[PDB]
Design a protein around this nucleic acid. Structure first.
Ligand SMILES: Cn1cc([C@@H]2O[C@H](COP(=O)(O)OP(=O)(O)OP(=O)(O)O)[C@@H](O)[C@H]2O)c(N)nc1=O
Ligand SMILES: [Mg+2]
Ligand SMILES: [Zn+2]
Lengths: 41, 592, 15, 1170, 145
DNA sequence: TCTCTCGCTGAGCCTCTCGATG
RNA sequence: AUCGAGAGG
DNA sequence: TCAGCGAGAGA
């Protein structure tokens, strides 16, 4: 309810969010991968 | 298709709750459609409007305003808000966990011949777990020309497919998991060895980290599929990688039970045993003499030993001398890696001594020698526990002779204060404490006498003279070595059962003066059931609290990751020793 | 004491 | 000794030393008595059915001058017996038939006599019947109704101890609980003001209710005052009504109406109706007889009977008692005391459901009589049976206390029928229950077992009845004791309840009495008022009857149980109920003496009704010729017993009976004629006797593992039989029906060979998994019924059901009506013996007997030929039964009787086993380290004694090989039976014939049975005397040799005999694996059952572990390629087939489902591509 | 192919944009035969073909004519998976409130207004919410702030 | 400002079996 | 495919 | 059921 009335935006930065969406977590063997992503923008 | 209708064995179809609420809303809203043209009086118009409101409040979150709608049975219908929250909602049942392929389950048994990086897998399970790899390799060698042909060939099993199965799993790891899964060591990786039967064989040294015992436990198994997954399993999750705890700095592999008892018996010392007084050329002569039958393991002798030490930069330098020792210690010296001193086995080896040996080997020499040392220690312990023939009998539990005095005199003292209650001299709320103190003192006396008799029960004739030595009683050695059994349990077995408590928490005035050797009567046994039931009830109902606290702790900190090397700050915390009352509870070394 | 004590600390419960 | 025919064949030796003054009662009384009190004809209206009929009647129309009356009821005779119902699949019940009379009075004159009356009999549904063993057959299945323990009606005075109102004060309160009505309780507050709650509603002030009884403030002051003080009297009342709103009586009534029903306009003609329909009415309120008794006892009243409704005076006394308790002159009662909780059984539950449905037809009758009819109406037309029968049927089949019957062994079967539950309608809940209700209360002594209880979330809420416990007239558990008069213990037995027992002082059963009966010592240990202490002999009033008075049936079967820890005793008692019957029953060498009672009261054996002599014996039938003294003037005198052969139980085990009597033998009544499962010569036999050694062996018994010799496997000591049932229904469906012909498309010639011409498997055909049992083609497609997987047994039974609208095939002639032919042949054979006997008796008139027998045969044929009502949409059902054998293997669970359990690790070759100096190998090796940490020392004492029983059996056996003379056997066995300290059992062999002595010796050559009752067992010295008599060392330890090298172990080892069990946890049922398969329909994730070929669940905690490792690619595999991602798994399978180990994942479908649901709730959610 | 998830309130125009079918008056799937009735909850026209590449009438059955709606019966030919993708809408005759924004401890459908929860509920319970709708429409946020 | 009613929120993990009603 | 009843770690 | 913490009461 609060999110809908505030118009919030989710950036997918934690472990649980990437687990839920099905991407590599930003830790361990995936960490460098995410560091590449921010280097692409 | 996200709200389907499922057919049944009969003609009727199972129906979903959503399709009922939707139909109710549709009919209640469409009833107003025809009424608009008829121009009904406003009295009927207003009431129907409200009937629409609640109908919508049915499709949305139900039960938020009272009088939840129900269906054919006597249970409320589940709305759209019920499909997103709770333990059965999408988040906690289909997105943070799910069911997977290439998995299996079975009962577990002990395998005493395995190496630390191996496990035993049944072949019937394996032939079905690794099916696509077998199909591919069958296609590779030309034994089939289609998927159906390969499937039929695998189903009607021949001898050619078993060699294929042998080559597929040659260097392919698997993951094993036990259900409660409290820390990260509840999942590990192993190399599979094909066996016969239906149970899974497990290494004795990984049990304590899994919290597993062979009285009906089950386990699950999963198969990695990509090169990255196989390499991660080999490099991160392999059992040879995990030897130190993440919670503290203590080793997680540690022998126990039969290994400890075997090593403890192997390194004990006697007086006037056979073969005493010899001078030997080394450990091999001791082994030869013991296996021939000319000498005992517990004989005191002189042996010539050579040992290596770090010289100045990790170079092994040797030294040779004569040492007074026993046959068993010299025999055991043959598995110690090069670089450790001889004094580390020249004594009776308990549980803590074996753990210290393992830690010293890990510190001085590294990782690869440590696993070999551990496996050799397990083999030696299992081998030498069987040769002793250690057993337990009813005469092992010895009852002190003076017990019948200590209780009786105590029963006198409790009587005397009763006389002091005949004529007013002490408060009626005071004799309780004095009687309790008398009984506590008597129990302490009996326990001390029992232990004093049990610890030195052996008397030995050295040579025309008598002497005392540590005894070889089975229960005493099992308690002393640290394999099984605390002192209080021996107290209960051969001493006195002590003082019980009422269900409220008060102390029952009269103790149990019997032990488990000379059994209990009806009243004492009835008294002793309250504590057992209270313990079992406490265990049964407080697991959920721990689980809830763990889930909350995991939720609050799930996103913290090391992201840099140095932040540049200069603040911090001052560390001081914890001293309260006068005794230093925590020093000023381990905290920093 | 016991588990309720630590659950009360980690929840910042008011005395 | 032993006197009966059955027991004299094998006399068990007893070490007990206390005489038995009271026998063990019948173990199934609680169910039989309860159902008898419900179905019987009561001359008065005291109990169930008559009392129910005398409560909804008489019913008369309002001023209509018409009334209908009840006079009598009758139960009919069942159409089928138990076996016919079980085979058919229907309920075993009797029809209820009631005669009714209807009277219509003269118009305009109520006192005027009825002009005309009509009498008729009506039918009012079907009532299920209990069997002789205390079960019900609902749809061919046996069920158990469990007894409920609940708080008694009455009035109770409770409080709180620092829960709310942290100021540090106690808040006393009182509550009134009726049997059928609304609640009413009085409570205090921190301001010391009286408040009242009705039906657990908002706390309205107390004095208002007084204003609802037409009272004034001066009258209230006169009632509650004579003046205030600090201790003697409190101003609680005055300070309460000085802060109370409203006045008079109408204001109080309308305030009560507003507080009860929210909204609505308060009228006057419909205002006092609520107050009247409250606790002062009879049709909607009943504080019943036990409630009345407890209410009067709580208030210190000298009356026991009374009204089933409350009154102003009672409320005033409740308030005064609560105020007096507040004033420091009262006391609070214990809610867990067994004087406040009572037992409700199946008979009491059946009458309540017969009243719920009886009022439904009562309302309909009144409406019909209102319309009126000029004698055209009849009683039958105004009575319907649907609702009452619906209520009864729902209770018998859907209640929480009607449970699927546990049928592993006889002991579990008899333990299920003595359970007491604190759950169900009107009971507790698992979550709501705390810690105090789960405890062991001091009043449990002698009434419920403090040992036997489940270990999961039901601990403390399920209990077992004690051996000698009983319910009284009001329903409170009671226990027997012996009267003590003038200091001598007598034989008079009195049953005392928990309330009364606290008054006297009771001596423990382990006391020493002289020849006359006087106590020996000058002090006696006794109980009083929940405590225990020493007293003088002149003070004693009662005494216990037995040393097994405290425990239940399962606990009294554990030998040396007083040397064990209570946790392990609990585990052993719970584990004895899981044992599986083996191929050959085997008696225990060490026992307690309760085996015969359990085996006989279970009802699994066959017990002779009358004495006589055996005439014909066979593997399926027994015939007894009755003695002259037990005949009747006009009956033949033949008893026929038919036995059960290879029938499946509820848990898919085997039930089989075999005879244990020979041709020409004499039998007295109450003698065992045949054994059922797990019975050996009339004694309960759960496991097997194994020779065991306590030592470690190369790490193969490292932690609760068990090493077993191959000799055990070769001799089938633990092989079991399992029976399974499969079905094949033919349904009428659109677009073409199913096919029952043998023809099947794409089926090889060999496939049809196993089946018959009609496509049905033959009897005795041996089949494996994935083999066609019935040919089924769906119009076609292959839908043939086959063995799913793994199971590979033999077809032993085929059944066929048909409707009266279709033809019959060849197998419908050779197996369907051939079953009827076999049944008719069996009936003819059964009748022929009696017919021939009567004809032979009368041949040394006949037309009447011939006509009667022909009529009986015709009736039997008509009963057999009757059809059955099948489910709509089907016409024929085919049922097939399969039998398989199971042998032990590594991975199977085994246990003892003291909580010692384990799994089998290895089957060892026999030359590898440890052996003694005579070359005899052992059977089992167990780890000694598992003994001392637990305190179950009783498993060691059993072993030593178990050795002593074998040695005696050795010396007899040798005497039967080197054939000796009878006097030596007589002398040795006499010396064996006389060994002891001072025992209560005496066996005299001088009164035996030589043949009897030889038979007894022949039954003793495998070992001499020993009985050691709980708390009255054998001592160490007696065991050592028996060992010395057997020429064995008195330590229990011998020398052993390693079978691999021939070398001697360094220390002596403990070797003996022990009783072991095999449990129903088989590795064959638990192993499963999957690679690919079927997925759910909405969230396309794999299914989750072995029966459905499902995958394992990878939960949140496993995800946490992988996250703590850092293995990102493994987690991504676990969430996409092996899960609800659809294109990724296909591409991955193709890649693995092609040899390329690489994945390209996508988006899971569950996320799309969640997004669609969020959109459905009227909320916009989007993936921001930019 | 994305980096963020955005959430906001919905509007009638957005809801009608999400839709493929008009207001659903019929109540039932169709119990008599497999073919569902039109315009209801289950409908072949609104949510797509029941079976792959086959129209309901059966006039088109195979690929090369895909993407062409049938003339006689007006059925699009597409894979049946679309039946778990498309949505529809119900056009009401009277406005109704949303329970989530009303039922809460900080009730946010009456947080902007000064009316208490009890009074707002009494007006909404009528003892249809045109009063609430007009009151929220007329309010000017900038002047109030 | 400081007590006192009044209420929705939450409550460990993974397997197996039966029946009744969809 | 939910609802009740039990069972194992 | 049982704690826990707002939210809305008032003297
Ligand atoms: C009943 N239960 C049991 C377990 C698991 O079961 C393990 C012990 O079960 P167990 O049979 O091996 O007995 P245990 O080893 O303790 O003692 P003995 O072997 O008899 O001496 C225990 O670690 C625990 O994880 C659980 N997670 N929830 C439960 O509700
Ligand atoms: Mg286990
Ligand atoms: Zn079309």
């Amino acid at each position: 309810t609060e999110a809908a009335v505030a118009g919030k935006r989710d950036e997918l930065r934690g472990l649980k969010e990437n687990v839920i969406v099905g991407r590599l977590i930003p830790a361990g063997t995936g960490y460098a991968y995410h560091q590449d992503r921010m280097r692409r923008r | 298709d996200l709200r389907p209708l499922v057919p049944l064995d009969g003609g009727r179809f199972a129906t979903s709750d959503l399709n009922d609420l939707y139909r109710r809303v549709i009919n209640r809203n469409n009833r107003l459609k025809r009424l608009l043209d008829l121009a009904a009086p406003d009295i009927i118009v207003r009431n129907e409007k409200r009937m629409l409101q609640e109908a919508v409040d049915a499709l949305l979150d139900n039960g938020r305003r009272g009088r939840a709608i129900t269906g054919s049975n006597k249970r409320p219908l589940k709305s759209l808000a019920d499909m997103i929250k709770g333990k059965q909602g999408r988040f906690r049942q289909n997105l943070l966990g799910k069911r997977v392929d290439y998995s299996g389950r079975s009962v577990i048994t002990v395998g005493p011949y395995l190496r630390l990086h191996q496990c035993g897998l049944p072949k019937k399970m394996a032939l079905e777990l690794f099916k696509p790899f077998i199909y591919g390799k069958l296609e590779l060698r030309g034994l089939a020309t289609t998927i159906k042909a390969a499937k039929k060939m695998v189903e009607r099993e021949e001898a050619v497919v078993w060699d294929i199965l042998d080559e597929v799993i040659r260097e392919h790891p698997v993951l094993l998991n036990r259900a409660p899964t409290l820390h990260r060591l509840g999942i590990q990786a192993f190399e599979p060895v094909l066996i016969e039967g239906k149970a899974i064989q497990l290494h004795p040294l990984v049990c304590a980290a899994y919290n597993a015992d062979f009285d009906g436990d089950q386990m699950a198994v999963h198969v990695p599929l990509t090169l990255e997954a196989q390499l991660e399993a080999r490099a991160l999750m392999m059992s040879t990688n995990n030897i130190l705890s993440p919670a503290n700095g203590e080793p997680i592999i540690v022998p126990s039970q039969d290994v400890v008892l075997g090593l403890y018996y192997m390194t004990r010392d006697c007086v006037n045993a056979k073969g005493e007084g010899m001078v030997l050329t080394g450990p091999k002569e001791a082994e030869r003499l013991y296996r021939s039958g000319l000498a005992s393991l517990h004989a005191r002798v002189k042996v010539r030993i050579t040992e290596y030490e770090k010289d100045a930069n990790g170079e092994l330098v040797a030294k040779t001398s004569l040492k007074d020792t026993t046959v068993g210690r010299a025999i055991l010296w043959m598995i110690v890696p090069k670089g450790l001193p001889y004094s580390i086995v020249n004594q009776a080896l308990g549980k803590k001594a074996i753990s210290k040996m393992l830690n010293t080997c890990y510190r001085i020499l590294g990782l690869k020698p440590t696993v070999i040392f551990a496996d050799q220690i397990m083999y030696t312990g299992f081998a030498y526990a069987a040769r002793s023939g250690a057993s337990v009998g009813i005469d092992d539990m010895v009852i002190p002779e003076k017990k019948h005095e200590i209780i009786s005199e105590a029963e006198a003292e409790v009587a005397e204060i009763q006389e002091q209650f005949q004529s007013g001299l002490v408060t009626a709320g005071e004799r309780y404490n004095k009687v309790i103190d008398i009984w506590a003192a008597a129990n302490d006396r009996v326990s001390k006498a029992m232990m004093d008799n049990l610890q030195t029960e052996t008397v030995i004739n050295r040579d025309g003279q008598e002497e005392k030595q540590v005894s070889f009683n089975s229960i005493y050695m099992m308690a002393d070595s640290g394999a099984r059994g605390s002192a209080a349990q021996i107290r209960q077995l051969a001493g006195m059962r002590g003082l019980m408590a009422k269900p409220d928490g008060s102390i029952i005035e009269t103790p149990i003066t019997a032990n488990f050797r000379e059994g209990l009567n009806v009243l004492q046994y009835f008294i002793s059931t309250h504590g057992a039931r209270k313990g079992l009830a406490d265990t049964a109902l407080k697991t959920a609290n721990s689980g809830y606290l763990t889930r909350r702790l995991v939720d609050v900190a799930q996103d913290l990751v090391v992201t840099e090397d140095d932040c540049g700050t200069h603040e911090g915390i001052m560390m001081t020793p914890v001293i309260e009352g006068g005794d230093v509870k925590e020093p000023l070394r381990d905290r920093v | 004491g016991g588990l309720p004590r630590v659950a009360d600390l980690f929840e910042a419960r008011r005395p | 000794m032993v006197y009966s025919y059955t027991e004299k064949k094998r006399i068990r030796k007893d070490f007990g030393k206390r005489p038995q003054v009271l026998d063990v009662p019948y173990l199934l009384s609680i169910q039989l008595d309860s159902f008898q009190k419900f179905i019987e004809q009561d001359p008065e209206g005291q109990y169930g059915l008559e009392a129910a009929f005398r409560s909804v009647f008489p019913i008369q129309s309002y001023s209509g001058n018409s009334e209908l009356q009840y006079v009598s009821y009758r139960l009919g005779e069942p159409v089928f017996d138990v076996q016919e119902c079980q085979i058919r699949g229907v309920t075993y019940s009797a029809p209820l038939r009631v005669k009714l009379r209807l009277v219509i009075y003269e118009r305009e004159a109520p006192e005027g006599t009825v002009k005309d009356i009509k009498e008729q009999e009506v039918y009012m549904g079907e009532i299920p019947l209990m069997t002789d063993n205390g079960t019900f057959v609902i749809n061919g299945t046996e069920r158990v109704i469990v007894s409920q323990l609940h708080r008694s009606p009455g009035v109770f005075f409770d409080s709180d101890k620092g829960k709310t109102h942290s100021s540090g004060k106690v808040l006393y309160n009182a509550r009134i609980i009726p049997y059928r009505g609304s609640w009413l309780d009085f409570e205090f507050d921190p301001k010391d003001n009286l408040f009242v709650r009705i039906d657990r509603r908002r706390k309205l002030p107390a004095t208002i209710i007084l204003r609802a009884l037409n009272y004034t403030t001066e009258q209230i002051l006169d009632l509650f005052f004579e003046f205030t003080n600090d201790l003697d009297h409190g101003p609680y009342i005055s300070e309460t009504l000085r802060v109370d709103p409203t006045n008079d009586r109408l204001s109080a009534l309308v305030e009560i109406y507003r507080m009860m029903r929210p909204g609505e306009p308060p009228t006057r003609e419909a205002a006092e109706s609520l107050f009247e329909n409250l606790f002062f009415s009879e049709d909607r309120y009943d504080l019943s007889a036990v409630g009345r008794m407890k209410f009067n006892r709580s208030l210190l009243r000298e009356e026991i009977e009374g009204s089933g409704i409350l009154s102003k005076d009672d409320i005033i006394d409740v308030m005064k008692k609560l105020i007096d308790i507040r004033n420091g002159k009262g006391e609070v009662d214990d809610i867990d005391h067994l004087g406040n909780r009572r037992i409700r059984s199946v008979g009491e539950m059946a009458e309540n459901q017969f009243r719920v449905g009886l009022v439904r037809v009562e309302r309909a009758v009144k409406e019909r009589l209102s319309l009126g009819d000029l004698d055209t109406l009849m009683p039958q037309d105004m009575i319907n049976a649907k609702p009452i029968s619906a209520a009864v049927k729902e209770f018998f089949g859907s209640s929480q206390l009607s449970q699927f019957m546990d049928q592993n062994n006889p002991l579990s079967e008899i333990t299920h029928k003595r359970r007491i539950s604190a759950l169900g309608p009107g009971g507790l809940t698992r979550e709501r229950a705390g810690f105090e209700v789960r405890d062991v209360h001091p009043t449990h002594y002698g009434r419920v077992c403090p040992i036997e209880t489940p270990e999961g979330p039901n601990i403390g809420l399920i209990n077992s009845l004690s051996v000698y416990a009983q319910t009284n007239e009001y329903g409170f558990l009671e226990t027997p004791y012996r009267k003590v008069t003038d200091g001598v213990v007598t034989d008079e037995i009195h049953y005392l309840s928990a309330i009364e027992e606290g008054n006297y002082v009771i001596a423990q059963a382990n006391s020493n009495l002289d020849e006359e009966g006087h106590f020996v010592e000058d002090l006696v240990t006794c109980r009083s008022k929940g405590e225990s202490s020493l007293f003088s002999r002149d003070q004693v009033d009662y005494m216990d009857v037995s040393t097994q008075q405290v425990v239940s049936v399962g606990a009294s079967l554990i030998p040396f149980l007083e040397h064990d820890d209570a946790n392990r005793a609990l585990m052993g008692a719970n584990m004895q109920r899981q044992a599986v019957p083996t191929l050959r029953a085997d008696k225990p060498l060490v026992g307690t003496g309760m085996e015969r009672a359990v085996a006989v009261d279970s009802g699994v054996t066959a017990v002779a009704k009358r004495g006589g002599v055996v005439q014909y014996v066979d593997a399926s039938r027994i015939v007894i010729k009755v003695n002259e003294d037990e005949m009747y003037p006009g009956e033949a005198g033949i008893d026929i017993y038919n036995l059960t052969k290879y029938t499946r139980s509820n848990q898919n085990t085997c039930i089989n009976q075999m005879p244990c009597v020979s041709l020409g033998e004499p039998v007295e009544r109450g003698d065992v004629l045949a054994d059922g499962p797990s019975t050996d010569l009339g004694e309960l036999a759960l496991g097997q006797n194994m020779r065991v050694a306590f030592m470690p062996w190369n790490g193969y018994n490292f932690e609760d593992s068990i090493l077993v010799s191959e000799r055990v496997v070769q001799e089938d000591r633990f092989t079991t039989i399992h029976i399974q049932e499969l079905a094949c229904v033919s349904r009428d469906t659109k677009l073409g029906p199913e096919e029952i012909t043998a023809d099947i498309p794409n089926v090889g010639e060999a496939a049809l060979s196993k089946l018959d011409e009609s496509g049905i498997v033959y009897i005795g055909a041996e089949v494996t998994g994935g083999d066609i049992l019935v040919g089924k083609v769906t119009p076609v497609k292959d839908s043939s019924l086959r063995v799913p997987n793994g199971v590979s047994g033999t077809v032993i039974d085929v059944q066929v059901f048909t409707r009266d609208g279709v033809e019959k095939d060849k197998r419908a002639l050779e197996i369907e009506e051939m079953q009827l032919k076999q049944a008719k042949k069996d009936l003819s054979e059964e009748l022929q013996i009696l017919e021939a006997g009567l004809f032979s008796r009368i041949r040394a008139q006949y037309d009447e007997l011939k006509h009667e027998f022909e009529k009986k045969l015709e009736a039997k044929r008509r009963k057999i030929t009757q059809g059955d009502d099948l489910a709509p949409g089907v016409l024929k059902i085919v049922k097939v039964y399969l039998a398989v054998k199971r042998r032990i293997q590594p991975g199977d669970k085994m246990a003892g009787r003291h909580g010692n359990k384990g799994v089998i690790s290895k089957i060892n070759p026999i030359e590898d086993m440890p052996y003694d100096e005579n070359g005899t190998p052992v059977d089992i090796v167990l780890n000694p380290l598992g003994v001392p940490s637990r305190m179950n020392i009783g498993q060691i004492l059993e072993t030593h004694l178990g050795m002593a029983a074998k040695g005696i059996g050795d010396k007899i056996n040798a005497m039967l090989k080197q054939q000796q003379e009878v006097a030596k056997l007589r002398e040795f066995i006499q010396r064996a039976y006389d060994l002891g300290a001072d025992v209560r059992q005496k066996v005299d062999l001088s009164t035996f014939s030589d043949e009897e002595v030889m038979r007894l010796a022949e039954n003793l050559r495998k070992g001499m049975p020993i009985a050691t009752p709980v708390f009255d067992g054998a001592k160490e010295a007696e065991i050592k005397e028996l060992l010395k008599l057997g020429d064995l060392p008195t330590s229990g330890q011998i020398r052993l040799y390693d079978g691999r090298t021939g070398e001697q172990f360094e220390r002596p080892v403990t070797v003996g005999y022990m009783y072991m069990l095999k449990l129903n946890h088989l590795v064959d049922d638990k192993m499963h694996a999957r690679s690919t398969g079927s997925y759910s329909l909405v969230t396309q994730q794999p299914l989750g059952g072995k029966a459905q070929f499902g995958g394992q669940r990878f939960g949140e905690m496993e995800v946490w572990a992988l996250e703590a490792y850092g293995a990102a690619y493994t987690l991504q595999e676990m969430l996409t390629v092996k899960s609800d991602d659809v294109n990724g798994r296909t591409k991955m399978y193709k890649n693995i087939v092609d040899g390329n180990h690489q994945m390209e994942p996508g988006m899971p479908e569950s996320f799309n489902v969640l997004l669609k649901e969020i959109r459905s709730l009227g909320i916009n959610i989007e993936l921001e591509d930019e | 192919e994305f980096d963020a998830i955005k959430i906001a309130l919905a509007s009638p125009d957005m809801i009608r944009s999400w839709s493929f079918g008009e207001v659903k008056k019929p109540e039932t799937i169709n119990y008599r035969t497999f073919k569902p009735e039109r315009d209801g909850l289950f409908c072949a026209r609104i949510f797509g073909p029941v079976k792959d590449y086959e129209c309901l009438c059966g006039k088109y059955k195979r690929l090369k004519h895909r993407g062409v709606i049938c003339e006689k019966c007006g059925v699009e030919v597409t894979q049946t998976k679309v039946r778990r993708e498309r949505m529809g809408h119900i056009e009401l005759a009277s406005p109704t409130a949303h329970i989530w924004f009303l039922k809460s401890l900080p009730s946010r459908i009456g947080l902007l207004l000064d009316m208490p929860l009890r009074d707002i509920e009494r007006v909404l319970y009528f003892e249809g919410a045109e009063a609430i709708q007009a009151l929220l429409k007329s309010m000017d946020l900038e002047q109030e702030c």
